[PDB]
């Protein structure tokens, strides 16, 4: 909804959208091959699909091809010092792709603008909009036009046919917050086909164990997830995809006893498998 959109804000007034209370699939985005630049800081691109986070900040803007490396920790330049700054320990990913055939106008595009001059440095995640005309010489400015008084704002002028370093690229930055808080965005969790009447491991909504799953006759209330025994032992689980009650029986085990006479009388021996049906012995 935010990145299929056809409008991307100016860099000095970039659009920030918060993302929370949902599941994020970054692996499918990474596998798709329609983007020309992808890099991350503080995390590797292959692992986002296994992490949980509290908030996601999505920054959207458009910048020229020869400036894409400015969006990085510990960087200096016109964008890094006048338009958009991120901290040295920024944890997230910067992605950028080709939008030359979608964000250009003949004779230079003036719908998109950037800040050329500013009086001070930009703090990380600091957004400023101003219109006082910049002063650079010994002539009054900041409200009056004189000699060498120039607006502290300039336009790229995205022409329809430019070099790769001047074509408009849509740049999206995902900022990540590892703060201690209940997670709201996580990678999608996957489930496999259920198998019953066999000794098989299970991981039911974080309840992990080993045993045999059978159809049960118990009747949970419609809020309980798993049952327990008298001695606080897991014995039944409600499946999260069928809402079905499954009894858990520990896999058959027992002692092995070797019944034998004296070794000098005979070497013939017998084996007793305690509390084991003979069908499960082999």
């Amino acid at each position, epitope marked *: 909804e935010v990145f299929n959109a*056809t409008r991307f804000a100016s860099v000095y007034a970039w659009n920030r959208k918060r993302i929370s209370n949902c599941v994020a699939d970054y692996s499918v985005l990474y596998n798709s091959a329609s983007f020309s630049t992808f890099k991350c800081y503080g995390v590797s691109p292959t692992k986002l699909n296994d992490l949980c986070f509290t908030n996601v900040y999505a920054d959207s803007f458009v910048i020229r091809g020869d400036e894409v490396r400015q969006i990085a920790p510990g960087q200096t330049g016109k964008i890094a010092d006048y338009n958009y700054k991120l901290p040295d320990d920024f944890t997230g990913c910067v992605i950028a792709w080709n939008s030359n055939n979608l964000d250009s106008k003949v004779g230079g595009n003036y719908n998109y603008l950037y800040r050329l001059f500013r009086k001070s440095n930009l703090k990380p995640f600091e957004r400023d909009i101003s219109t006082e005309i910049y002063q650079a010489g010994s002539t009054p400015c900041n409200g009056v036009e004189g000699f060498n008084c120039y607006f502290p704002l300039q336009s790229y002028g995205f022409q329809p*046919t430019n070099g790769v370093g001047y074509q408009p690229y849509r740049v999206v930055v995902l900022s990540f917050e590892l703060l201690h808080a209940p997670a709201t965005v996580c990678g999608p969790k996957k489930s496999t086909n259920l198998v019953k009447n066999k000794c098989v491991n299970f991981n039911f909504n974080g309840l992990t164990g080993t045993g045999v799953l059978t159809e049960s006759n118990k009747k949970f209330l419609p809020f309980q997830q798993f049952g327990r025994d008298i001695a606080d032992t897991t014995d039944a689980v409600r499946d999260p995809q069928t809402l079905e009650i499954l009894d858990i029986t520990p896999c058959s085990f027992g002692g092995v006893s070797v019944i034998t006479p004296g070794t000098n009388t005979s070497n013939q021996v017998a084996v007793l498998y305690q509390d084991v049906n003979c069908t499960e012995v082999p």
Partner: antibody, heavy 126, light 105 residues
């Protein structure tokens, strides 16, 4: 099937105004970027304009800048091209053509036309 | 901005002998993004070739050409009495003047 029906056009004095419409049926009209082109009598096809999926961004050609406006509502399912201050050299037959959208992670228009509708003749003279 | 000049302006050919059509682009940064069309004088242009290499559905195997750089050439293997039409090239923001094919006599 899938066709585009052109409506409007005809005789009009120079310096007037006119409205052209392209009704669509058989395909999801909102999700495809749209194009307008024209063909002069006995001459090659000349491109006119673009429009986005929502219908707010256009890049009207140098021949048609300032006096041509293109609009695309998604509910009524039709495309509009309004012309003002028409001049004599614009006597032609107008077509409306789609733009191939891949429907992928990015819509990513391919700058190509796949279907050509049955257009109308517009004539400007005194 | 881009100009697509098509050469030759008018090509005359027998109903069976083959030929080629060449197009020159002013600014060759298309990266093999090109389209070809064949339009009879009395009906709408029909699509022939996409990406200057592959053919679309319904196009006969005869229509097959390839080109790189500013010189984009489209080849036609054999001829039938249907080439009495105008061939048009297409970039994203430009078009060709058109080349007409005439049966010799």
């Amino acid at each position: 099937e899938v066709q585009l029906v052109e409506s409007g056009g005809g005789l009009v004095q120079p310096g007037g105004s006119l409205r052209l419409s392209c009704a669509a049926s058989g395909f999801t009209f909102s999700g495809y970027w749209m194009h307008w082109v024209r063909q002069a009598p006995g001459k090659g096809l000349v491109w006119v304009s673009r429009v986005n999926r929502d219908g707010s961004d256009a890049d009207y050609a140098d021949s048609v800048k300032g006096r041509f406006t293109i609009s695309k509502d998604n509910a009524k399912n039709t495309l509009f091209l309004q012309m003002n201050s028409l001049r004599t050299e614009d006597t032609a037959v107008y077509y409306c053509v789609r733009e191939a959208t891949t429907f992928g992670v990015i819509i990513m228009p391919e700058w190509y036309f796949d279907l050509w509708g049955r257009g109308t003749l517009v004539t400007v003279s005194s | 901005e881009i100009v697509m000049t098509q050469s030759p302006g008018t090509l005359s050919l027998s109903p069976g002998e083959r030929a080629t059509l060449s197009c020159r682009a002013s600014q060759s940064d298309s990266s093999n993004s090109l389209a070809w069309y064949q339009q009879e004088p009395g009906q709408a242009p029909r699509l022939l070739i996409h990406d200057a290499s592959s053919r679309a559905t319904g196009i006969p195997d005869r229509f097959s050409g390839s080109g790189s750089g500013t010189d984009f050439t489209l080849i036609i293997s054999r001829l039938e009495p249907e080439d009495f039409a105008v061939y048009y090239c297409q970039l994203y923001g430009s078009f060709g003047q058109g080349t007409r094919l005439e049966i010799k006599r």
